[PDB]
Amino acid sequence: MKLNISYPVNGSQKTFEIDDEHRIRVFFDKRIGQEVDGEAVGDEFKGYVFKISGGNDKQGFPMKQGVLLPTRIKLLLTKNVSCYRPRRDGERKRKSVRGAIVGPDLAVLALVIVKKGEQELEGLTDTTVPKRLGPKRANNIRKFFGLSKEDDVRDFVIRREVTKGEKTYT
Amino acid sequence: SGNGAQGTKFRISLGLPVGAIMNCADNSGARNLYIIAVKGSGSRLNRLPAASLGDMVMATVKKGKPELRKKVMPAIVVRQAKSWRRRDGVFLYFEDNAGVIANPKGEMKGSAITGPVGKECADLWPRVASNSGVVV
Amino acid sequence: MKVEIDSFSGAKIYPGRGTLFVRGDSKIFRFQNSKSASLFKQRKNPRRIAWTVLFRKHHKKGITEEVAKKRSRKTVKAQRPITGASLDLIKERRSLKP
Amino acid sequence: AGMTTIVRDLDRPGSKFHKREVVEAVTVVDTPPVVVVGVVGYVETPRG
Amino acid sequence: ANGATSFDRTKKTITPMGGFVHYGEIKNDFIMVKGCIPGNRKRIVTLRKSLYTNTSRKALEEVSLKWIDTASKFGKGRFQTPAEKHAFMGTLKKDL
RNA sequence: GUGAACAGCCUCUAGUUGAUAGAAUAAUGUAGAUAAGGGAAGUCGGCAAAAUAGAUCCGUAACUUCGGGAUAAGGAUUGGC
RNA sequence: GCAGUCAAGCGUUCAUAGCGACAUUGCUUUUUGAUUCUUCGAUGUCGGCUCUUCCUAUCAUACCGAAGCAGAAUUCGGUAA
RNA sequence: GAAUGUUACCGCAAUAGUAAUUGAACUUAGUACGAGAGGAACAGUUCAUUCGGAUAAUUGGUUUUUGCGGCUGUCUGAUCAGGCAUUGCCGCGAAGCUACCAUCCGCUGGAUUAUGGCUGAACGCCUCUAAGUCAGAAUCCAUGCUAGAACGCGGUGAUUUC
RNA sequence: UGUACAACGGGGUAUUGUAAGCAGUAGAGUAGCCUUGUUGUUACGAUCUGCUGAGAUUAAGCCUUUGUUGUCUGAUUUGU
RNA sequence: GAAACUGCGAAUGGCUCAUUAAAUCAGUUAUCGUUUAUUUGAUAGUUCCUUUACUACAUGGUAUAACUGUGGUAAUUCUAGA
Ligand SMILES: [Mg+2]
Ligand SMILES: [Mg+2]
Ligand SMILES: [Mg+2]
Ligand SMILES: [Mg+2]
Ligand SMILES: [Mg+2]
Ligand SMILES: [Mg+2]
Ligand SMILES: [Mg+2]
Ligand SMILES: [Mg+2]
Ligand SMILES: [Mg+2]
Ligand SMILES: [Mg+2]
Ligand SMILES: [Mg+2]
Ligand SMILES: [Mg+2]
Ligand SMILES: [Mg+2]
Ligand SMILES: [Mg+2]
Ligand SMILES: [Mg+2]
Ligand SMILES: [Mg+2]
Ligand SMILES: [Mg+2]
Ligand SMILES: [Mg+2]
Ligand SMILES: [Mg+2]
Ligand SMILES: [Mg+2]
Ligand SMILES: [Mg+2]
Ligand SMILES: [Mg+2]
Ligand SMILES: [Mg+2]
Ligand SMILES: [Mg+2]
Ligand SMILES: [Mg+2]
Ligand SMILES: [Mg+2]
Ligand SMILES: [Mg+2]
Ligand SMILES: [Mg+2]
Ligand SMILES: [Mg+2]
Ligand SMILES: [Mg+2]
Ligand SMILES: [Mg+2]
Ligand SMILES: [Mg+2]
Ligand SMILES: [Mg+2]
Ligand SMILES: [Mg+2]
Ligand SMILES: [Mg+2]
Ligand SMILES: [Mg+2]
Ligand SMILES: [Mg+2]
Ligand SMILES: [Mg+2]
Ligand SMILES: [Mg+2]
Ligand SMILES: [Mg+2]
Ligand SMILES: [Mg+2]
Ligand SMILES: [Mg+2]
Ligand SMILES: [Mg+2]
Ligand SMILES: [Mg+2]
Ligand SMILES: [Mg+2]
Ligand SMILES: [Mg+2]
Ligand SMILES: [Mg+2]
Ligand SMILES: [Mg+2]
Ligand SMILES: [Mg+2]
Ligand SMILES: [Mg+2]
Ligand SMILES: [Mg+2]
Ligand SMILES: [Mg+2]
Ligand SMILES: [Mg+2]
Ligand SMILES: [Mg+2]
Ligand SMILES: [Mg+2]
Ligand SMILES: [Mg+2]
Ligand SMILES: [Mg+2]
Ligand SMILES: [Mg+2]
Ligand SMILES: [Mg+2]
Fold it and tell me: Residue C87, exposed/middle/buried by CB under 10 A (0-12, 13-18, 19+)?
């Protein structure tokens, strides 16, 4: 099954395909939220700890947290709820949902690094991707740089350069 | 299991001998089905031909649309209430005995099926497979 | 090979074991043995049957250390200021004064 | 000694259970090593 | 790990929980033959080479076990190993 | 005592404890029972067996000599404190 | 009841693929008659149920020969119980 | 089960019995054949019917396990714990027994018939037949399987002192 | 006279479904005492809860035992 | 000025005449028996704390879409993880 791992420190994320069910078997009967020692998944992840965050089984149905039962159910999903974006004010639909207990029918296990191991992963620790946006509210700037509200936020806002053919802008 | 049966069927505990009555689970107008015979059954002094999930039977309709009554027609068994054992080791059983009325080819007289259906029957008759919702 | 659980008690149904029952509404019930099944046919309620899982969970039995503390935290403390924002000019200004 | 149950895949191309798990009964016969304590040799006669 | 396999890996012999009923606690090499055999438990049995080669496609199949049952036969057995038992049960008025 | 009761079931008083005995528990019996799914296909024939059942309340057809039919049929309820 | 021999005919043509009159020769003894030998100091005298074995004049199944056998279907015949 | 010295083990096989059965689907193939309409089979594969011999992992039935629990009536002052009611009634119930209601297993050589042929005279030709001969069936004989002659037999171990 | 056999006890296995005892601010409530209540008190009350997946039963054709106790030469017959 | 958030509208309109016989409906009443987005007209010096070593008012808090990236499903105005 495919493994959708993420290193939230660098914003990195690479996918892995693990065959050899003995290695997959570690995640079986584990819920979303429990931590996994990677040494059992493989050797490249030795000392790496993984957070189980979700995933989609075959037929692409997502997992929903805390909905135990390594099977599918059909919940009545509402506003502010996982695996559902409404279409009308006060709209609910009954949709299928895959449980939060890992099973062999999962196409992809979504994983989150919690502790680094002893070997840099290929495109996960070796590379880092910067955050997209910057602080736009006044006080959030004062707390991204620790500004002590006398330091004139107007100069501490972030500027993003951009090229227009032969005119570099800001 | 006779004409137009697509594939074979691993043996499954017989549960409906001649004279049993099963719910008719299609929308044809019939309510029940009185079994009078089983296609493909054999012979032994004093045995009653019984039918298992997936067998085609000859039946009459005791309760239903008057046009459906007083006449013998094929029908396909879609639910047994007598446990049987699949090759994956499970003994399973439905809550009724149920079937749908068909023509000798295997096509169905009614447009849908109001029940679960045994896969041993869905695998065997495509027309039942179409009209079925939840299977097993 | 999946080990199933009893839909009345909570017992592990290893392969072959127990019996399976397709109810009229196509809801499926598995039992590990004819005990749970007869209770189930009797319309008994697992939360009132002292040895079932659904009973013991409800009456909070034997779950003592499953509600204790743990140690599952992390530590990152990284920086990657803003995409396209000349991050090589965003560290010579992130030198907090107070 | 007795019997038990076995679960195994089924390699039988064409069977509706091909490459699928089946559960099966087996007997077990306790077979500690036998010990050789003699040899006898037989000849052919018009009587057997 | 007589009763373990390439897929099971739980270290355990073929002896079921609390012993083969009416026989004992198999502790020597053994033969596991598919299905059933003439005779009853504790009886002397002869296993003999086939008198003919079978092509048959049913023989010549090279089986490989996934999981061998080792739950108790003296009742409606629910656990393969005693470890599994304490795992699912919890702790009782005796143990500790 | 239970209960409508001289019913059945248990008790007090009184009277019995009389009926060859011992060891086994094969077949076939005699007498008592239970059986998955089907439900009379068995049979001359539902023979045998099973199902039903008390009470309070609701409800009750044709037909009739108006008296009946009628516990028609069909339902609900029933402990303890 | 079953099977023959002759072959006038039937079979568009063509006696005999398949049939076959007028005649004629047989076999069989689950038809019915004819008879009255055995039993009238008694051989339990319909049918079914159950169970076993036997016969072949073979309905099916194995292998064959033939056709008015293109195929498919069928029909005649052989070894066959 | 007496007696062929005693007793024990391991064996041989005379004779007798004997068993497997039928179907369908896939594929061959919309093929051969046919103007068309229609429309096969050998090989291979998956299942099935009828029969048989076992077997009890599993599921199911059975319950005096009177094993646990529950219930009515009564009797032991109450409690505890029990007796009686032709096994009082009810739920669950292991063990055993048991079911196409459950699972497993059911061998392969030869010789022949019908028939089709080889070579080939009688009969300078011709002929499967006269001599000689090939192929050949749910047949038959074996193989296999069950019994083992209690007056059929082999090999082998030990063989008594008051 | 010993991987001996037995009778018990122990451990496993298994069946039932939570023993007796005690306790409780659980309990529709009910009575009795007065100092007639700013939880007033002594108790009683189907039932519920805790100690408690407890207790009971488990080879009579279940398994296993470093424990305890015991047993271990009666009779008859046979030779080429 | 895409996307998206937010706000509002989607309860109007249009269609049909199935049900409906003291119901609907019509004329005539009642709200001293109630809710009312909106439009219009009015309407707000009081908010703190045992009330000097004092409360951000020169204005307090995160947590999200879009987006970036990694993904699942034969399949949809499906959506998951980061
Ligand atoms: Mg798919
Ligand atoms: Mg028939
Ligand atoms: Mg009959
Ligand atoms: Mg359709
Ligand atoms: Mg049972
Ligand atoms: Mg007297
Ligand atoms: Mg007498
Ligand atoms: Mg007597
Ligand atoms: Mg006696
Ligand atoms: Mg008897
Ligand atoms: Mg019963
Ligand atoms: Mg029955
Ligand atoms: Mg009925
Ligand atoms: Mg009837
Ligand atoms: Mg009849
Ligand atoms: Mg009559
Ligand atoms: Mg009747
Ligand atoms: Mg009667
Ligand atoms: Mg009954
Ligand atoms: Mg009447
Ligand atoms: Mg009441
Ligand atoms: Mg003539
Ligand atoms: Mg001609
Ligand atoms: Mg002519
Ligand atoms: Mg006749
Ligand atoms: Mg006479
Ligand atoms: Mg006489
Ligand atoms: Mg006589
Ligand atoms: Mg007489
Ligand atoms: Mg003949
Ligand atoms: Mg011609
Ligand atoms: Mg011939
Ligand atoms: Mg015969
Ligand atoms: Mg014969
Ligand atoms: Mg002598
Ligand atoms: Mg085709
Ligand atoms: Mg033509
Ligand atoms: Mg047969
Ligand atoms: Mg049998
Ligand atoms: Mg049993
Ligand atoms: Mg009792
Ligand atoms: Mg009482
Ligand atoms: Mg008490
Ligand atoms: Mg008495
Ligand atoms: Mg009496
Ligand atoms: Mg059989
Ligand atoms: Mg052989
Ligand atoms: Mg021979
Ligand atoms: Mg010849
Ligand atoms: Mg000759
Ligand atoms: Mg000649
Ligand atoms: Mg044969
Ligand atoms: Mg054989
Ligand atoms: Mg002898
Ligand atoms: Mg001898
Ligand atoms: Mg408890
Ligand atoms: Mg001890
Ligand atoms: Mg409108
Ligand atoms: Mg928040």
Answer: middle
Q: Which of residues 41-70 of E touch D (CB under 8 A)?
A: 41, 45, 47, 57-58, 61-70
Q: What is d(CA B132, CA B80) in angstroms, rounded to the nearest whole number?
A: 16
Residue with tokens 């143990």: E95
Stretch (H or E) spanning D2: strand D2-9
C62-83 as b/e, with b when 16 or more CB fall inside 10 Å?
eeeeeeeeeeeeeeeeeeebbe
Q: Where are the alpha helices (DSSP H) in chain D?
A: none
Provide the experimental method for this PDB entry. X-ray
Alpha-carbon torsion (A83, A86, A90, A94), positive or negative: negative
Cα end-to-end span (Å), chain A: 45
B27 burial via Cβ count (<10 Å: 0-12, 13-18, 19+): middle
Q: Kindly provide the residue ranges of all beta strands, DSSP E only, lying in chain E, ordered along the sequence.
A: 30-34, 65-68
How many Cβ atoms are within 10 Å of B37's Cβ, its own excluded? 13
> Is residue A37 helix, strand or coil?
strand
Which contiguous run of DSSP H or E holds residue A154? helix A153-156
Neighbour count for residue A108 (Cβ, 10 Å): 19
Q: Which residues of D touch C16 (CB under 8 A)?
A: 5, 7, 23
Whether A28 and A52 have beta carbons less than 8 Å apart is answered as: no
Residues C79, C90 contacting (CB under 8 angstroms): no
- Sequence-distant (≥ 6) Cβ neighbours of residue A11 within 8 angstroms: A128, A129, A130, A131, C80
Query: For the range E81-90, what are the long-range contacts, defined as Cβ-Cβ under 8 Å and sequence gap of 24 or more?
Result: E81/E10, E81/E12, E81/E17, E82/E17, E85/E17, E88/C12, E90/C62
Q: If DSSP codes are grouped into helix, strand and coil, which group holds residue B122?
A: helix
Distance separating alpha carbons of residues E6 and A100, to the nearest angstrom:
28
Span CA (E24) to C1' (I5), Å: 19
Are B42 and B5 in contact by the 8 Å Cβ rule? The answer is: no
Contact status, residue E3 vs residue E14, Cβ threshold 8 Å: yes
Breaks (C-N over 2.5 A) in chain E follow: none
Of all nucleotides, the one whose C1′ comes closest to residue B15's CA is F37
